[PDB]
């Protein structure tokens, strides 16, 4: 009794134009009497001929395992073409057929918010940075982290969780040393989905250090400037009258 499974592409191959998506039909549990396995691919009923197959090998529980690979185009997967594997053996009374495609519905696009560490965690050696991504549909997303153009690797990511109104959310956690957060580096969460503009967006995170509380600027007094514009003219007229009287006395 062989077992047939079928697997969709990886969500980063189907979004950029320099990689290659492929769907995969797997048939395991071939017994030791029938080495003849015949595959038949169907794209919307029409059989195709650019499929590929890897040779078998002997397995753990006295079985075999055969893998068949089909490559697709990028704009065929993002429009909803059904894909059918048809499996024919000799011990099996009937062929086994499976179909997969993209999930159907109006797409939405996600929001991205980055969160700093809790301030109680600065009594430890390592700290945890956080990226919330919410509000998307379908649930095919890809999230990565980076810093100074070089990629990080110490991150984990939850599965997508269904929200209240039919969309999804997830969180991602990145663990860095405290020395590298305190000195003011810049870290980035990068997201790819099918409904963002050119399938890509980023957000950044940094520290921006502490303040001073200087207290060096002299509170105000009640009568600082009160008639100072008046009392220039008084010393003008007093000065000129003084010059006139000094001239009239010194004339004699």
């Amino acid at each position: 009794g062989p077992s047939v499974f079928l697997f969709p592409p990886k969500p980063k191959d189907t979004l950029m134009i320099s990689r290659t998506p492929e769907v995969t039909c797997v048939v395991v549990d071939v017994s030791h009497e029938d080495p003849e396995v015949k595959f038949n691919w169907y794209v919307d009923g029409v059989e195709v001929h650019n499929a590929k197959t890897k040779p078998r090998e002997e397995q753990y529980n006295s079985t075999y395992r055969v893998v068949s690979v089909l490559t697709v185009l990028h704009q065929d997967w993002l429009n909803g073409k059904e894909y059918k594997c048809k499996v024919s053996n000799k011990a099996l009374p009937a062929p086994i057929e499976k179909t997969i495609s993209k999930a159907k519905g109006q797409p939405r696009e996600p929001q991205v918010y980055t969160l700093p560490p809790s301030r109680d965690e600065l009594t430890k050696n390592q700290v945890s940075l956080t990226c919330l991504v919410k509000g998307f549909y379908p649930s095919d997303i890809a999230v990565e982290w980076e810093s100074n153009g070089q990629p990080e690797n110490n991150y984990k990511t939850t599965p997508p969780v269904l929200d209240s109104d039919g969309s999804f959310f997830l969180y991602s956690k990145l663990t860095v040393d405290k020395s590298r957060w305190q000195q003011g580096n810049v870290f980035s969460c990068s997201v790819m989905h099918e409904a963002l503009h050119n399938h890509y967006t980023q957000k950044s995170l940094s520290l921006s250090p502490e303040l001073q509380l200087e207290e060096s600027c002299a509170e105000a007094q009640d009568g600082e400037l009160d008639g100072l514009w008046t009392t220039i003219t008084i010393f003008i007229t007093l000065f000129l009258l003084s010059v006139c009287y000094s001239a009239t006395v010194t004339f004699f």
Binding site: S216, C217, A218, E219, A220, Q221, D222, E224
Partner: protein, 139 residues
Amino acid sequence: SRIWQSPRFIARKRGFTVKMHCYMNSASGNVSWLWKQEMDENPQQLKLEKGRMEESQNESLATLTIQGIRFEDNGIYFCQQKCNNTSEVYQGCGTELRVMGFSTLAQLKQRNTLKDGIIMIQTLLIILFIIVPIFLLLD
């Protein structure tokens, strides 16, 4: 925590403009503003000088704007909302203003000793002009 004012302390310089906020839901009474000073005990109703103080209101926020601040604006200011249902007056925490100047603490001593020197120097001449010429006449 049904009213909420912000901030708790402002410190601007002389001549500038301050704004104060109060977060409430404006379908329950009307917010009025009050002013407590250093020499008061209970806050009083505030008198708005036209053209200098304004008082505006969204659906979810009330605001007070004071332009061109000076020394007789120092105090602590409150928003107050009176409910339409229970007649229980609720009051905010209270924002405090303090008006500052431009110079530093080393330049204030300068003009203090300047003003004291001017006032003493021209006290001495007025004494001397009424001691000296009468002393000349008495022989």
